[PDB]
Structure formats: structure tokens, C-alpha cells
Swiss-Prot record, chain A:
Domain of life: Eukaryota
Subunit structure: The APC/C is composed of at least 13 subunits that stay tightly associated throughout the cell cycle: APC1, APC2, APC4, APC5, APC9, APC11, CDC16, CDC23, CDC26, CDC27, DOC1, MND2 and SWM1. APC5 directly interacts with MND2 and SWM1.
Name of the protein in question: Anaphase-promoting complex subunit 5
Organism from which the protein derives: Saccharomyces cerevisiae (strain ATCC 204508 / S288c) (Baker's yeast)
Additional note from the record: Present with 259 molecules/cell in log phase SD medium.
Role, per record: Component of the anaphase promoting complex/cyclosome (APC/C), a cell cycle-regulated E3 ubiquitin-protein ligase complex that controls progression through mitosis and the G1 phase of the cell cycle. The APC/C is thought to confer substrate specificity and, in the presence of ubiquitin-conjugating E2 enzymes, it catalyzes the formation of protein-ubiquitin conjugates that are subsequently degraded by the 26S proteasome.
Family of the protein in this entry: Belongs to the APC5 family.
Subcellular location(s) of the protein: Nucleus
Swiss-Prot record, chain B:
Primary role: Component of the anaphase promoting complex/cyclosome (APC/C), a cell cycle-regulated E3 ubiquitin-protein ligase complex that controls progression through mitosis and the G1 phase of the cell cycle. The APC/C is thought to confer substrate specificity and, in the presence of ubiquitin-conjugating E2 enzymes, it catalyzes the formation of protein-ubiquitin conjugates that are subsequently degraded by the 26S proteasome.
Top-level taxonomic group: Eukaryota
Shown segment, full-protein numbering: 102 to 151 of 652
Cellular compartments annotated: Cytoplasm; Nucleus
Quaternary assembly: The APC/C is composed of at least 13 subunits that stay tightly associated throughout the cell cycle: APC1, APC2, APC4, APC5, APC9, APC11, CDC16, CDC23, CDC26, CDC27, DOC1, MND2 and SWM1.
Extra remark beyond the main annotation: Present with 1332 molecules/cell in log phase SD medium.
Protein name (Swiss-Prot/TrEMBL): Anaphase-promoting complex subunit 4
Length: 171, 50
């Protein structure tokens, strides 16, 4: 959380050292459930700052392989998180459009299956990817429908607080 | 039979193939099942095995 606060002020590097020591303490507790919270926070920080993917002790692809086969029960939102991170990497990796659509299908189906209202953060992230995904395909008619659902000024945690004002200024 | 040979001057790529094919909801007596989508007239128009 202090690492999160550090990332909010764009310190970045100072957060890395603070976060690193969080992994060591988790091992001492010898509790499995907290590592998933640690692992989820990993790529959320990399998603905002992709330039630091090399600095971590675990590559992003390693996490996706772990979370996909994490368990079959007591996860609920872990898989909804797991598949969206694969979609961002596949989109960045300029993978084949057949695989990107299938991967995005996995993330859309699992998010809407459970309640989307309570998990407001991932629901907004779905819209941001789908508008970006379809805008990249060149179909503004599809992008427009999903654009009315993207929330403004809401932004997200661990990414500043004036990011929404700046983003509105860019447009 | 249509013969659309690949031509460089044709950049009209298809995206419907890349998008996954739809499904159908049909319910039997025991439960509701999920089956692959087939066009009402696709049974006599489907690509023949032979």
C-alpha cells in the first residue's frame, strides 16, 4: 500500500524496493491466500508502467501461466483478473486477431457471469480494452456503443489522482 | 461453385472467420444444453464430408 502510494506520485523506482520486501514477509507468514493478492498487484503496477517489466524477479508470462491453473474453487475474481492481463500482453505482442478475440472472450464471459456492478474496477477495464480493441480494428460504430459505458473522472487506484484531468485534456 | 483465388490486388480481408462462431440454446427434457450454431438451411448446404 505504501508501494501503491509511491506509484501514485510517479516515484516508480522507490515503490519497487518497498514492494520487494513485501514478498519476503509473505513467505514468513506461510499463508497461500495473500500471495495471490501480491501477485495480482504485480501486473496491475506493470500495466500502468510497462517499462519496468524487466526489473521484476518474475516475468509477466510466468504469472499468467500460474493464475490460469491456480485452482477450481475459492478464486471467483482471480480468473477474471488473470485473463485480462493475458489480453493486454497479446494486444501489445500484436498476436493474431483470432487469438486476441478468443482471449478477450474469456475475460468478457467471466466478468459478466458474476455481478459486474460490485466489481466496478474490472468492468471499466473491460470497456477500456474493448473500445481500444475495436477501435484498433477500425470500427467506430462498435467503439461508440461501448464508449458510452466507460466512466470518466473515475480513473483507477495506484495511478495518480489528476490522471483523469490530464486524460481529458489530451482529447 | 465460387472460385476466389488469392490475389494481391484484393486486400478485402475477412474478420468474421477470426471472430468465434456462435452457439445455440436448445433445451431437452432433462436439462438445457448448448450446441454449436448451424444455419436452418445449413444441413443441406454444409460443406460435404464427401
Amino acid at each position: 500500500s505504501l508501494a501503491t502510494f509511491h506509484s501514485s506520485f510517479n516515484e516508480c523506482d522507490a515503490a519497487i524496493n518497498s514492494f520487494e520486501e513485501a514478498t519476503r514477509i509473505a513467505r514468513e507468514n506461510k499463508d497461500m491466500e495473500t500471495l495471490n493478492l501480491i501477485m495480482i498487484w504485480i501486473i496491475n503496477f506493470i500495466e500502468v508502467h510497462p517499462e519496468y517489466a524487466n526489473r521484476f524477479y518474475i516475468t509477466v508470462e510466468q504469472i499468467i501461466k500460474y493464475l490460469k491453473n491456480s485452482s477450481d474453487v475459492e478464486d471467483a475474481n482471480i480468473f477474471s483478473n488473470a485473463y485480462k492481463f493475458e489480453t493486454l500482453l497479446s494486444m501489445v505482442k500484436e498476436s493474431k486477431t483470432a487469438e486476441v478475440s478468443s482471449s478477450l472472450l474469456k475475460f468478457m464471459a467471466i466478468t459478466l457471469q458474476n455481478v459486474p456492478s460490485q466489481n466496478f474496477d474490472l468492468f471499466q477495464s473491460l470497456v477500456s480494452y474493448e473500445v481500444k480493441f475495436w477501435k484498433e480494428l477500425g470500427y467506430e460504430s462498435i467503439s461508440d456503443v461501448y464508449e458510452k459505458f466507460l466512466s470518466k473522472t473515475s480513473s483507477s487506484s495506484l495511478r495518480n489522482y489528476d490522471s483523469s484531468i490530464i486524460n481529458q485534456d489530451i482529447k | 461453385p465460387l472460385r476466389y483465388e488469392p490475389n494481391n490486388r484484393d486486400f478485402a480481408c475477412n474478420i468474421i472467420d477470426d471472430l468465434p462462431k456462435l452457439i445455440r440454446f436448445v433445451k431437452d427434457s432433462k436439462r438445457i444444453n448448448i450446441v454449436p450454431y448451424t444455419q436452418p438451411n445449413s444441413l443441406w448446404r454444409g460443406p460435404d464430408e464427401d
